[PDB]
């Protein structure tokens, strides 16, 4: 069916033209068991105050646009009380729910690829050098891809067909993905569990997964139609818990 509703915390999300819900690699986000845990102290578990939908900034799908990416959970640094527990606790563990919505018309056309890339290590633009943190993820805005080659000395290689990683951009469909076809679809929701090699990790020096939105089939329309087609991203943490409470840093 095409109508869904996802209620988390004090916030709901209603859609009327939905494809389905892709759920990670099969499993649902849950809490850390006693069989796998290694932190000795008691973990905190804020149910409603942390696990709720946060709406990020809006971008503009232009006719010459090529792609964007957000790195998580760094994109929700100043989003409510989820970002306040990250500063006070040394450890964190959470799953997510990534709702991406872009409605245009019956007369517009286009396509998007919404992947969630775990451990998306990204390559620099000047080889024999290294990126900096200010070039990987902005504070709330989207870092975009470039159609041509990136010339910078400390930026990500933001070419689009190599996906910023050195791999084929068509082969990104292994990861949990949907497609926003403006002919059939309106929104794309992806539920990602906690994917890491360690049971918990500090969510300041480790981007857990990267959300990429890439238009494979570009946007065209007619001059009678609208000329502003925005994309909005709404991400909710799910089953979040923390350890290691100390002073806030930073700040």
């Amino acid at each position: 069916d095409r109508v869904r509703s996802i209620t988390l915390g004090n916030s709901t999300i209603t859609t009327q033209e939905c494809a389905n819900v892709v759920v990670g690699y099969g499993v649902w986000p849950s809490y850390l068991q006693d069989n796998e845990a290694t932190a000795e102290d008691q973990p905190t578990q804020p149910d409603v105050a942390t696990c709720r939908f946060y709406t990020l900034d809006s971008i503009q799908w232009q006719k010459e646009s090529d792609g964007w990416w957000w790195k998580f959970p760094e994109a929700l640094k100043n989003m409510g009380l989820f970002g306040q527990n990250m500063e006070y606790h040394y450890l964190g563990r959470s799953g997510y729910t990534i709702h991406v919505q872009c409605n245009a018309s019956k007369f517009h056309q286009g396509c998007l690829l919404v992947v969630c890339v775990p451990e998306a290590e990204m390559g620099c633009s000047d080889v024999e050098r290294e990126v900096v943190a200010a070039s990987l993820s902005s504070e709330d805005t989207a870092k975009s891809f470039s159609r041509t080659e990136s010339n910078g000395q400390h930026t990500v290689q933001t070419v689009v067909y190599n996906a910023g990683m050195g791999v084929g951009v068509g082969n990104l469909t292994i990861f949990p993905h949907q497609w926003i076809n403006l002919r059939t679809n309106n929104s794309a929701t992806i539920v990602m569990p906690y994917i890491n090699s360690v049971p918990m990790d500090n969510m300041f020096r480790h981007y857990n997964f990267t959300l990429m939105i890439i238009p494979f089939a570009k946007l065209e329309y007619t001059e009678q139609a609208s000329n502003y087609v925005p994309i909005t991203v709404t991400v909710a943490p799910m089953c979040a818990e923390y350890n290691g409470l100390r002073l806030a840093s930073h700040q």
């Binding site: 494809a19 290590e121 290294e130 992806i190 020096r205 480790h206």
Partner: protein
């Protein structure tokens, strides 16, 4: 049997409302359409299997990971032994096979292939006994030997193997020796909590070093030797498969690249020839 492939059940003509070919990729779903939905097929008993395509049969083949040379000369004591910070990034044929998966957990056999020669110049040997090599593994933080004939070559706790030339290659087994629960091939993050330092997997690689030397002075001439290390991962579990790499590697500590074309060119979009 195990683990065979599915058979094609026989099919006749049809006129149905249940069309299986028409689907929707927008849900992020790969279709389960077998050939019996779009054409008439016959009952064949497919006896093929996928034993050669499992994870354990794909990775349990030894590959070279380093090539190290060392002398037996006098002077320049850095050439009298070789060093290796343990990596799986220096030789590309095993680096690309590992980097189809994000995480990996396995045991390993490590085979050392040492092959020597006689160095040229005046005052050659003309009668030499066999050579013997000591291949010491230093876990992270141990005493590093500054040269050959050092106190750190005693190795009361470091595992060392002694090997005379002419016999079978040396081989031992190593368990899953990581700190975490999987060898992270990719690490999207930093080393310091202030988002500064070393971006990438090079901060997670803390496995130790490998040192190899001649335990014999000789006293007449020089003989170089070439240690080649071979890695065979066994008892392998793997998680989160990645796309295979497209651009060629540049560095042994980075995923840095230069942007390459997606495929090789062809003449036309409809180029069924020739």
């Amino acid at each position: 049997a195990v683990a065979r492939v599915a058979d094609t059940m026989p099919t006749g003509p049809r006129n149905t409302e249940s069309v299986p070919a028409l689907t929707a990729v927008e849900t992020g779903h790969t279709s389960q359409v077998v050939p019996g939905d779009t054409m008439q097929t016959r009952h064949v008993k497919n006896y093929h299997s996928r034993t050669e395509s499992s994870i354990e049969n794909f990775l349990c083949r030894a590959a070279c990971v380093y090539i190290a040379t060392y002398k037996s000369a006098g002077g320049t004591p850095t050439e009298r032994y070789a060093s290796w910070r343990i990596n799986t990034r220096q030789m590309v044929q095993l680096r690309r096979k590992f980097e189809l998966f994000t995480y990996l957990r396995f045991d390993m056999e490590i085979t050392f292939v040492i092959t020597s020669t006689q160095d040229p110049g005046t005052q050659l040997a003309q009668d030499m006994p066999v050579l013997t090599h000591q291949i010491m593994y230093i876990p992270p933080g141990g005493p590093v030997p500054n040269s050959a004939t050092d106190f750190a070559w005693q190795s009361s706790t470091n595992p060392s193997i002694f090997w005379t030339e002419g016999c079978a290659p040396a081989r031992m087994s190593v368990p899953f020796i990581s700190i975490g629960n999987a060898y992270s091939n990719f690490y999207d993050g930093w080393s310091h909590f202030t988002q500064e330092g070393v971006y990438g997997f090079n901060s997670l690689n803390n496995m130790g070093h490998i040192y190899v030397r001649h335990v014999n002075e000789q006293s007449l001439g020089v003989s170089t030797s070439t240690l080649r290390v071979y890695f065979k991962p066994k008892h392998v579990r793997a998680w989160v498969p990645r796309p295979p790499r497209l651009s060629p590697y540049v560095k042994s500590s980075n995923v840095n690249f230069k942007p390459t074309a997606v495929t090789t060119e062809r003449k036309d979009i409809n180029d069924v020839g020739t």
